[PDB]
Amino acid sequence: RILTTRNGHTTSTTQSSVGITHGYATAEDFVNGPNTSGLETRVIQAERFFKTHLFDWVTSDPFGRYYLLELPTDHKGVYGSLTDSYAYMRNGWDVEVTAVGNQFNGGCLLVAMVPELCSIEQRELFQLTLFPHQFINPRTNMTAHIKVPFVGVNRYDQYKVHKPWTLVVMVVAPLTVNTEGAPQIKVYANIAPTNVHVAGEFPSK
Amino acid sequence: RILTTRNGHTTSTTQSSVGITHGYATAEDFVNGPNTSGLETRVIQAERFFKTHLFDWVTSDPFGRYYLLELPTDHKGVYGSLTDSYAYMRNGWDVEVTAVGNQFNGGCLLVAMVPELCSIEQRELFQLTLFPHQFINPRTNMTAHIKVPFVGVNRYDQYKVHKPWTLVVMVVAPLTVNTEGAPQIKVYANIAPTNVHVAGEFPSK
Amino acid sequence: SGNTGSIINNYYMQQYQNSMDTQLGNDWFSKLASSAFSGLFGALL
Amino acid sequence: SGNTGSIINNYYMQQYQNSMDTQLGNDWFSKLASSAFSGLFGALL
Amino acid sequence: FTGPTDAKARYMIAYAPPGMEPPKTPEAAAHCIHAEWDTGLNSKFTFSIPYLSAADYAYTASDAAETTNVQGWVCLFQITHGKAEGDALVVLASAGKDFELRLPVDARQQ
Amino acid sequence: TTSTGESADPVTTTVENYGGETQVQRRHHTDVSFILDRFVKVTPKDSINVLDLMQTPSHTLVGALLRTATYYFADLEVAVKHKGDLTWVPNGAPVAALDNTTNPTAYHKAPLTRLALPYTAPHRVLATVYNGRPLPTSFNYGAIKATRVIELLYRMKRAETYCPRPLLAVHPSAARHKQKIVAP
Amino acid sequence: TTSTGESADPVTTTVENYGGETQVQRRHHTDVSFILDRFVKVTPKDSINVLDLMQTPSHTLVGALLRTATYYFADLEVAVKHKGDLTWVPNGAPVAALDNTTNPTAYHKAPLTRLALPYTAPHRVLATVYNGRPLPTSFNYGAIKATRVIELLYRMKRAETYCPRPLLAVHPSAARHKQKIVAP
């Protein structure tokens, strides 16, 4: 039930989590390859949480609204400065998507961290439970907390061009404010980069 | 004679150095105090060299021109971003002041890393050889390379208010372009922060 | 091992037959199928 | 050993395959590459 | 460096990776993998630029479709000089200790 | 077999819940390196065409069990009906290279010409989709040219794939997708 | 890494000077007896032509990694499309010899005729350049004749060379020599 996760100097507590969904691996692969010549360093100051707004769940939305965002998104803090001050870098992800409703709102919600994609057709939605996923069901839980490692074609990636992961939500069953439930839900996210490495330095202005 | 110094992924070579002048200590004091509650981290990516322009030595200048700069100065690279993204931080210094002339230019030049000061009177110049110093004499050498630790009133310092160190140059003996020497010298600097620690995080915009 | 069904070693050497692999320093989805919970979750009668 | 990639000895004898060598009584440029000085030449700090 | 006995100089060479336009001033290039040397008794100085690339291997050609110069630049600056008018700094280039070259294709040179 | 559904934890209850007894289930025909080794046929181009494993159609057996895996690595094989002196450049050669005879060149010999060429590419593993639809230039196996290429086939060797992707069956209008089946 | 430059002593400083760590560098594709074994094609003459390893063009892959070595020794191979009864004399036979059948003569058999002939010459090792441009008569491998030679190829075996020589890349007008590269 109760579960407290901590990344860096930031924490988070949830009292209804149904577990963590490790995806595609438990540990990361070898991070000192032959391409970087050993000129790579591991920054630890940039493994803290940060937040964003996805959308607002509402009764009008039928099955199949996804509203996906691709990340690494723009970042005010430290991790946002690394892609500006370094060429190649790699990092996993540790998401947490929260939708606080009520004990009495029926409906469902599916969230999965899928690899590289731009758009999904309506037929492929029925098969979204192949990627690391978790259901948000307002009768029981309110947080997802998927946990995926870095994966890509080549070892170190240039985040100015290739965005490998893409957090995807989806309304499996419509919201129903039957009698006493909250009129609408506002979905948020609590992503946090984990295990960030970085190599190759830029000349400033 | 030959001496190659390296800080981070950057190096530097000089073929006329007369040694390193360790000042006020060989090692630093305890860097995990009771005031920071252990919430301090040591960034290693910000121990590289950087450069600046001091002034141009010329025959007109008599004894007593200092042209001092106080540092930490503004910085384009990483170390310039830390004071913008963190409250308290501490670091030593490892300077290298170069003035390339000729075997045949007479004159002298004194460079010393002095603690906190704003201005010096003409009488105090005669006693500048109390702080960590080194003479730049164009007959023999062309680089100074003083090396000092962090020192201050309180353990961690707020570099937006207090600048503890201040690199000071001074023309002990005027330049003389006697017969074959270079007409003027242009003094540069090659400072590099060393052993940087940092604690206390800011909220971005 | 794919559609390879001869009991004689191929005439050509291994390195000329196909690209030799290199090491540094189904695997996962088969670990998932074995982790599958199958027992009863309540008290049987 | 060049583009020779069979695991079976050639049908013809050695002397008929190619000219047999004769003795009397990369060799040098590989000795040069190993002689290459690479260490630091001055006092590191 | 091939100057007279009474001429002195100081140089810097820095390596700028792809993504940002190359530096144009030495003060703006000191955040690269630079390294500086000084002329004196020993004349020659050899600096070996590293290999940094996302993909494991890199091409030995440049297609017209790619004007971005996917590998990067290598800049060489002169910090200062003393009575060094009109001198010369001859350069050379050699293979590294771990250069690897592969996939042979004889394609239209002779 | 009630269990928390919103957990993505696999739960495969079996027939032994109500007296059943599972027979033995052996799966050889559904392996990933056994089903891809079958000479899928691609629409061949004119004189010069590139060896890219994605120009194969998306409704075949090899073309559709390949666009179900995000990443893949596999050696290659071809068998072409060249009317000429087909040559083959490696990955990354200037496209004017496939006019010289030093490159591996097979001479005409009726009816086919079956080659087994390695996997040459900078990346450690290729990819079907790419989040830059056009993929980069680096994703290929090489380029062959002849006077007039007539046929072309692909047969991946040692195939191994990662990170699965959705597969789609045909949607029928009726309740059930009926059709013909061979019958004496 | 300052060292006396006017000494011709190799000095190869590495990436470990500023924290680097050299990966492993394996070189198989660049050997001298592996890169020359590739059937370079020469401009064939009429009925009679001589087997000289220098009439191959100076811009191929075999013709240009050969005019980079002063001396060389290598057995030979050919594969010709003779329209007739091709014969082959050894090195030094009177040029009227290649009309008799006792000399090694291959009969017509479509499409090619691949031979593996030894290295026969007085000198212990041949040479590309010669300081007597015309080389001597003694520098060759033999002479073949047929009714009409159509194609001819050279494939050196057991090649081994000495005393390297300069190699030249093409000089571009622009800052960089751009060109096409195969792309899907």
Automatic annotation (TrEMBL), chains C, D:
Q: Tell me which domain of life the UniProt entry assigns to the organism this sequence originates from.
A: Viruses
The listed locations are: Host cytoplasmic vesicle membrane; Host endoplasmic reticulum membrane; Host nucleus; Virion
Task: Give the signal sequence positions.
Answer: none
Q: How does it assemble?
A: Interacts with RNA-dependent RNA polymerase; this interaction allows 3B-3 to act as a primer. Interacts with host ISG15.
Q: Could you tell me what this protein does?
A: Forms an icosahedral capsid of pseudo T=3 symmetry with capsid proteins VP1 and VP3. The capsid is composed of 60 copies of each capsid protein organized in the form of twelve pentamers and encloses the viral positive strand RNA genome. Upon acidifcation in the endosome, dissociates into pentamers.
Homology family? Belongs to the picornaviruses polyprotein family.
Q: List the protein's name.
A: Genome polyprotein
What organism is this sequence from? Foot-and-mouth disease virus serotype O
Instruction: Give the lineage.
Output: Viruses, Riboviria, Orthornavirae, Pisuviricota, Pisoniviricetes
Q: Describe which stretch of the whole protein the shown chain covers, with first residue, last residue and complete length.
A: 216 to 285 of 2332
